[PDB]
């Protein structure tokens, strides 16, 4: 069947594992749990289309740029992951985003801004500031909670549809 080849990628601690784990098993993983690198595999209709979701969860930390390649290589669709509450994680954006289309050799790669943590109150980032963004760079926005599961469906969909158009 129809494959989407996935993957979440963003500074570590905003959430990448929290929101795949809340698609996958449905429930809100509220501890400390570094990621090295985690792959899951799905099934789902999506848009009556019966297709399997493969999504590799990322490390945050630096010290697996190597890893990196890989995967950015192989994957066909990017959820790139910042917590509102985090400016740091929201800057390193453009980063992910140009490794991305160095590696790939490609300006318009099938990507979904994301800002995870939509739930806290201490928000650092605005959300016009993060849309202006996404406007730019030709790519939705869409904001999420891995706790309260907001837009957790919407991102991973949209995703999905990203790739489809392209
Ligand atoms: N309040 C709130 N906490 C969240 C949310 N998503 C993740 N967290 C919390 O933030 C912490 C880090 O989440 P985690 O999924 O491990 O982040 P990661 O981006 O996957 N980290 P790493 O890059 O190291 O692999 C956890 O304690 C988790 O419960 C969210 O939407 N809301
Ligand atoms: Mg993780």
């Given at each position: 069947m129809?494959?989407?080849?996935?993957?979440?990628?963003?500074?570590?601690?905003?959430?990448?594992?929290?929101?795949?784990?809340?698609?996958?098993?449905?429930?809100?993983?509220?501890?400390?749990?570094?990621?090295?690198?985690?792959?899951?595999?799905?099934?789902?209709?999506?848009?009556?289309?019966?297709?399997?979701?493969?999504?590799?969860?990322?490390?945050?930390?630096?010290?697996?740029?190597?890893?990196?390649?890989?995967?950015?290589?192989?994957?066909?669709?990017?959820?790139?992951?910042?917590?509102?509450?985090?400016?740091?994680?929201?800057?390193?954006?453009?980063?992910?985003?140009?490794?991305?289309?160095?590696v790939?050799?490609?300006?318009?790669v099938?990507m979904?801004?994301v800002?995870?943590?939509?739930?806290?109150?201490?928000?650092?980032?605005?959300?016009?500031?993060?849309?202006?963004?996404?406007?730019?760079?030709?790519?939705?926005?869409?904001?999420?909670?891995?706790?309260?599961?907001?837009?957790?469906?919407?991102?991973?969909?949209?995703?999905?549809?990203?790739?489809?158009?392209?």
């Amino acid at each position: 069947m129809t494959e989407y080849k996935l993957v979440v990628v963003g500074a570590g601690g905003v959430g990448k594992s929290a929101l795949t784990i809340q698609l996958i098993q449905n429930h809100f993983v509220d501890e400390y749990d570094p990621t090295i690198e985690d792959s899951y595999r799905k099934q789902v209709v999506i848009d009556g289309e019966t297709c399997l979701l493969d999504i590799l969860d990322t490390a945050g930390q630096e010290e697996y740029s190597a890893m990196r390649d890989q995967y950015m290589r192989t994957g066909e669709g990017f959820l790139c992951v910042f917590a509102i509450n985090n400016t740091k994680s929201f800057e390193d954006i453009h980063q992910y985003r140009e490794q991305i289309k160095r590696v790939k050799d490609s300006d318009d790669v099938p990507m979904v801004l994301v800002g995870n943590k939509c739930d806290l109150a201490a928000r650092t980032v605005e959300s016009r500031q993060a849309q202006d963004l996404a406007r730019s760079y030709g790519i939705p926005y869409i904001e999420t909670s891995a706790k309260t599961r907001q837009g957790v469906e919407d991102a991973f969909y949209t995703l999905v549809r990203e790739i489809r158009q392209h």
